[PDB]
Amino acid sequence: STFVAYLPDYRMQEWARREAERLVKYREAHGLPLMESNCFDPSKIQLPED
Amino acid sequence: SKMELPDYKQWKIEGTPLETVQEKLAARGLRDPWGRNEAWRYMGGFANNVSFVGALLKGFKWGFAAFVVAVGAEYYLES
Amino acid sequence: GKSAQFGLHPWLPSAMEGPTPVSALLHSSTMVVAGIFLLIRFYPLTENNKFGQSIMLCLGAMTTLFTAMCALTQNDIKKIIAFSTSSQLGLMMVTIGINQPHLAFLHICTHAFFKAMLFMCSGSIIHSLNDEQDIRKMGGLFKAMPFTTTALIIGSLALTGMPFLTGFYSKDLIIESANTSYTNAWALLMTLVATSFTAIYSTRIIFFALLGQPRFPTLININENNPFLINSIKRLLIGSLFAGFIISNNIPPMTIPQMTMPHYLKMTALTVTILGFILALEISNTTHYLKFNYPSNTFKFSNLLGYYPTIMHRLTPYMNLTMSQKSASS
Amino acid sequence: ITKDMLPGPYPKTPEERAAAAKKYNMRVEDYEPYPDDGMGYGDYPKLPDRSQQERDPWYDWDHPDLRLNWGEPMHWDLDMYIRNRVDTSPTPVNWNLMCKHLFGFVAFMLFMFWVGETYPTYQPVGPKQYPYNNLYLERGGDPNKEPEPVVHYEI
Amino acid sequence: SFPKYEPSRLASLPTTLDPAEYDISSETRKAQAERLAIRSRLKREYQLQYNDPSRRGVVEDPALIRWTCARSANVYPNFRPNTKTSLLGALFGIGPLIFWYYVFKTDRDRKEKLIQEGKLDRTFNISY
Amino acid sequence: SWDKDVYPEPPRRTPAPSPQTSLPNPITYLTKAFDLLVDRPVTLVREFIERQHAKNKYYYYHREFRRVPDITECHEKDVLCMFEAEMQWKRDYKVDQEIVNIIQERLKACQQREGESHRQNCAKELQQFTQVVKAYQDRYHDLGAHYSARKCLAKQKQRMLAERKATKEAA
Amino acid sequence: AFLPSAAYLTHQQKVLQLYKRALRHLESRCVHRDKYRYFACLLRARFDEHKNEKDMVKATQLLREAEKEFWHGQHPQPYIFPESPGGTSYERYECYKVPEWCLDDWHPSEKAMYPDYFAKREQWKKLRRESWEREVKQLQEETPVGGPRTEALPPARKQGDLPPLWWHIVTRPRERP
Amino acid sequence: DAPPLTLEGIKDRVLYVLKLYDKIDPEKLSVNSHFMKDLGLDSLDQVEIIMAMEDEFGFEIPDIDAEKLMCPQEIVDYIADKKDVYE
Amino acid sequence: SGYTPDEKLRLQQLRELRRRWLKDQELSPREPVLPPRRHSIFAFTHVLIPVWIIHYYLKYHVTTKPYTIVEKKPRIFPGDTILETGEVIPPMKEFPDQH
Amino acid sequence: AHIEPRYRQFPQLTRSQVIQAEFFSATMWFWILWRFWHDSDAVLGHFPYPDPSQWTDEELGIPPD
Amino acid sequence: GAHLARRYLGDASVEPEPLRMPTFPPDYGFPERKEREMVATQQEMNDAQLVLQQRDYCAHYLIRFLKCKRDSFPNFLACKHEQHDWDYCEHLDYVKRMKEFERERRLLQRKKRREQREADMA
Amino acid sequence: MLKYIIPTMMLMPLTWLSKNSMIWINTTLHSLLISLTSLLLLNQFGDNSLNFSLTFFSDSLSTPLLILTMWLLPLMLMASQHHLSKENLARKKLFISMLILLQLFLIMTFTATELIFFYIMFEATLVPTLIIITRWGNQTERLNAGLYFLFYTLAGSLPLLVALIYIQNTMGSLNFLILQYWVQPMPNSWSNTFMWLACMMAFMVKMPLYGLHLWLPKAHVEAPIAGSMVLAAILLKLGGYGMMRITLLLNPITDFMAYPFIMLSLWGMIMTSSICLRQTDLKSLIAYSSVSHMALVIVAILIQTPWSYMGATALMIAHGLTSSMLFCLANSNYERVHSRTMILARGLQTLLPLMAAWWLLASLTNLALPPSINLIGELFVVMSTFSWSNITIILMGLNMVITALYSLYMLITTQRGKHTHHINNILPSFTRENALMSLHMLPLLLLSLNPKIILGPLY
Ligand SMILES: CCCCCCCCCCCCCCCCCC(=O)OC[C@H](COP(=O)([O-])OCC[N+](C)(C)C)OC(=O)CCCCCCCCCCCCCCCCC
Ligand SMILES: CCCCCCCCCCCCCCCCCC(=O)OC[C@H](COP(=O)([O-])OCC[N+](C)(C)C)OC(=O)CCCCCCCCCCCCCCCCC
């Protein structure tokens, strides 16, 4: 119980807060949207022909 | 352990509604052999029970006296 | 499921098999209101919706009418007050079903007090008669237990909704909001009939348990001088006398009060209570005659719990177990 | 326990029927089995299908909580027929009459509830009046869109 | 005159209203006497095996193990597949499966055809 | 402490306590009793622990990952670089999940702190939450329990063809 | 019909049981003492008016009509005594009826807490275990062939000899432990 | 609650109930006085006595044991056994 | 009916044995042999230590985390004065009185 | 002390329970009477109810036709 | 309360539906009709944290009652006059509501007399 | 994974070289040392699994199962050390060696990176359980229990192995660190249908699926309780590991094919809950409850949503612990009364209070009392199945009634009521028994505080 109580940051979950705590702090100061509908860059994809 | 039991001649069925019950069986020619068994419930302090309205207004005298005393006290207080 | 309404009601009268304080807490004052507490918890969602409000109002009226009808002619005292608190739960879902949250919450706060105090007074009477819980063997206890006599009279008066008591500050507001609103007329009618039936069974408890000639056996072990019981009944009597007034004063105004109505829609609660008192007084006076009245279908339908623990507690387990064994296990 | 203590197949002739009856230690004529319809019942005795509340409660039973003695050929559904389960007590009212009364009562007042839903009660009043276009901004509406100005008139 | 209380599956006749108590044929008392003899033998055996100071263990009732063996282990060896058993097995084995399959199927096509055309409101549904 | 931009809170406006009647209230006396009996030893043991903290003050650092080429520039069936692309994609997945979590925290805090008139003063938080929910639903929803960067890229491709078809059919 | 000793209920016993059940239901019907006494005297007078009837078949048919009206006119919830089956306190105190052989399982460090009781228990057990062979000798010669015909236990026929099969009927604890 | 009762207490109670019965004369009764032999009552009077004792002690006696105890001493013995006197 | 002498004698002996056992159920005065081994202690241990512990926890571990103890802002009425700013909310217009 | 049970007679009554019961009944009735004299509103009425039939037409602004 | 029998057992045309009323023009027979007045400005009405159900047209008595309750602690019974004033205002609003109901009923009944006159001569 | 396999293979001579009276103490002590050592597997990252070597890896999924396995071995050793006191010393060492070999094959099963290795040791596990079931049982039907247990499972997997070999000829590697990136979609055809059936049916039998569940009650009412606990608690989880390692390759054909499997699992879990409502043996009742729980797990992994995977893993671990401790309860009762009848021994709360408390805790944790991990997993699966379709909640709702109704009833007739008069050998609580029961119960409560360690590979 003492080992699993002080286990060093399981799956970096707390780290998942901290960088996120940085990231919005970036994009709320420069007018950028919070998250975008495109997961990757939409200009770096060769769209197939239709 | 040992309790004293009351006299079994002091339990009389007279003055009770069981006397009227025995009157009814005497009118129809029957006997009530178990009136003396239930005779004790209809005398003494166990008898003379107040009615429903008498149950609701229990202690109304003291309450109304205190109410009129308090309303007189407030009547003098506002002056 | 939690407040024991229609469809899932009979566990509330069935749960009187436990100890008396267990009933008096859980199935009288505290645990049974959890479903109603969940309903008034989610009032911003039920405020703008009409379907759920209508169906839950009709379910509450159904529950309070059926439970009051079953409570009219029952012979067990604890079962009578269990049906009483189920009817009160139906009334609280009726008044939250008409978009009045804080009135229902105030009724919860008052009902816990007075219903718990009636339950412990009944438990003291039960213990003083050597574990005998039938209303057809008590009575003549006005001068035998004067403290519990006064407490039971005050509690029945508060249950009926008598003026300027703890039940007056919540139930009268509930019924005046139920009268003057866009309600179902059938629900309002069964609310009034439920109020009359509450008056009838409360004065039935008073007449058959506190007045008249004694019916218990001759070994008289009447005793109530223990300081714990006296102090507890005194505490809840002070509560049921003044805490309702204190709570109704100190709650912030969060709803529009309705007080412009005609006289016949304002005297309704007291007049129906007095009418129920008069009708049950007629019944109690006519029970003293040396006659015999053959019971009709009304008494069989009333005293046998609406036949609901006789039909739905016999057919559904039979069907489930025969499906489980004859069709599945074998 | 051996090969003729556990229950066996269906007994056909009177002799094997008597052997099965003395296997369960009961009367020969009162031991009658279920009909061999292919459900795999066997030579188990068929009780008259009554509950266990009907048993004598004052009799000195071998098992008092079950009202069951020792060596009795028990029911095929003893688990179903305990006191804590389905009960077959003789009710003072007729069962069909009970079902008819309950169904009629429930259907009648459900129909009356729906009838009252069709024709409701109300108060002789008008609608409630709210300022600022019936509280357009306080309802959560957007402020960049100007609502239609509706006013409430005195009488 | 008086209501005739009908027999029912959930409401048996009482032990007192049954006319079978009040017949005075001789084989009735003979059967009752032989039942009492059987019960007396069983009760005598139980009391002799149950009041023993030397015995420390469970009184092994043959009826309990007999019933538990007849409940499970003696179903297949005395089973013969006929029209009734096969019909009941097919009715209670593949019926509800087909019913639930068809209900869940048509629910799935309705939900899918609602969600591909955008008619299903999935504004806030991001946990799945 | 915490940064005030990522968790914004309006300044507090507490009205002046001015008695109307002459009856005193016990709240001030109990507040003084709380400040005397409770707050002072708590502050004393807090200054004790922080003074013991001041002797041994070592630092820990927030780990940062450099940007790696994504799944688009990965040769097919060459695991040695799509492994890194998937690694970065999973880290960004966790970051985006926590971003939606912090927006939900903002919305809940606004709705609680705005009292009974929260339906009007939390319009900005509702708009931000709706935008971030639509972004998360476009970015990560319906991937399945066996999600991977290839499936997310295929879903993004299908959404792009749907948008291009909607543009062409309504041009 | 079902009795520990008998196999057939005599018509006199059935009449008495009908009288008992019908009068108990009458008492449960009318609560008050005076009405109960009056109607009980009426029922006793009715049974007395039909008492002088020595015809078996006529009393048979009269019993059948009587049972039919008794079931037709019974209360749905008859009064049941608090210790009777069906009562409110039926087998409630049975959770404390721990049998005596649990005292066999006690630790020796607690068996010295009550030395006199445990010495009395061991001498009682010695008495029982020496009387066991005597009582099974008593049943092994008094029982008829093919087992007993009735369940009525025989008494002890000798002075000093304990009653046969006496233990587990006399061993049941008090109803208020 | 519910004080234990000695054998003489229930004996006083049973003789009191017998003395309060009109059919029993209050002089000829005893513990072993048979109802049909010493006093010559009927079976119905015996069930009346059984009901009186059931209502007096507040518990139910089974019908077989109601008809089996045939003397006041048998009533005393059965009540003392069921209440387990002399604890 | 009555009692056969056999069953009556049997229940007499059984009642004798029962009365004997219930006589021997009484305990002697020396049993049980037990082996050998502040007014304001409740209001200090059960109250004050929980107050100190929960106040330490709430002051230096929960208030440091954002959006944990979120409190509704107090209502603002006309004629009040904010202590942290000093600006006074201006007085509300006179009532068009009717009573 | 503890009350010894009495056989088929009236049980003993301590003066304390009777005094407390009469006290509670007195405070009950006194509170009822005091609240009924002071408030006198929620049991009888708060405001008058104007009838719908006594209104005229110029209050309602109905031209005649 | 005879309107229920006049509507359901009688004729439902006389009693207007409370769900959608009034549907008549508001200037019908009311020249220079003056609307009701709001005393509290919207910001000063909103910063008191007042629930939407109680946002009536004369909530000045209500907000003064809330202020009286908030500054008279612990003497809770010292603000019954403000409660009486708020009750008076709510009562006056209810008089306005049944005046609107009577106006709608009498105007629609005048429409019935009009169509009866159309039946008489037109 | 050599730091746990070598301790097991080195404890093997320790139980072979131990003295004639210190086998149990030494084996229990050293297995508890291995159990403490096994906590080092929790070095988990939010992106990458702890890949130890070429043929061994352990993500967030298999680590709680490994910890459960080598925590389960000492509990089995204590639970099977009573009735083997009269058994010969060589056969005692044979039994302990069989348990040790079963643990070794289980830990090698959950960490096998290659699916062929996973299959090979996943039914190298078949030999020790078969040996224990057939040899150390207590009835005749154990012989039949060696047939239905065996010829079901192998008949599900001898197709499957061929299918696995086919993947070795198709993808070129069956490694799981490779197949997460080389996976191709499965087209709609009859060949892919039969490949899906072959890859599914082995673990469908091993769950078991309803219809194929006949091997579970027949192999539980007669086993030595070490075998009963390993079968109920950890041996049924091989199907779950098969699901969460195989379902990556079987997309997207699983979505429009698993309809009859889900119908069978839901209606069969309803049927088995109903069968629990009318049982007479404790062991059969617990086995049918396990059938219901594994049918729920089948639905959870078949709908394949992340919430369902969290709920499936949590429900798997919680059900394993609960079923093992329920079998410990039933073994204590069968030890004391020498029978398996439920109605025989009643009212044991009057005689055994601490076993009554353990009965109450077992029944409370069985019906998913919050905030236990059983309720966490069951609730997550409930929400995922509501997300699959609406009407499913009805097919859940009745079960959640029935899964309470027997779960108390199985308690009540075994604990509440008038005790049986003719039973007098009810001994008090042995310290070994209650120590085993507490060692079962305390981790189940403790995991409710920190559930994030047992929430699957995608928490
Ligand atoms: C794991 C899979 C296989 C299963 C079997 C495993 C076998 C081996 C078991 C090894 C030992 C156990 C390991 C798991 C231990 C889990 C517990 C644990 O350590 O959690 C860590 C967690 C850690 O907390 P945390 O995660 O919040 O802390 C964050 C970590 N730090 C501190 C570094 C920032 O411990 C707790 O949560 C403890 C909280 C305080 C203690 C409890 C206080 C309240 C107690 C109850 C009061 C009354 C309440 C009301 C009751 C009403 C009636 C019911
Ligand atoms: C528990 C008992 C029941 C177990 C049931 C197990 C599942 C049922 C199906 C199993 C089939 C056997 C394994 C097939 C693996 C195929 C893998 C694959 O890629 O196939 C594609 C290949 C496709 O052929 P191909 O790949 O060679 O062709 C090249 C590709 N095309 C088609 C484009 C040209 O499928 C087959 O070759 C046939 C597959 C079906 C096999 C049918 C025969 C077996 C039937 C089931 C018997 C089950 C045991 C019964 C007895 C049990 C004991 C009593």
Ligand SMILES: *C(=O)CCCCCCCCCCCCC
């Ligand atoms: C006109 O009378 C309408 C009154 C409101 C609707 C009917 C309410 C009926 C029930 C309450 C009043 C009962 C009076 C005896």
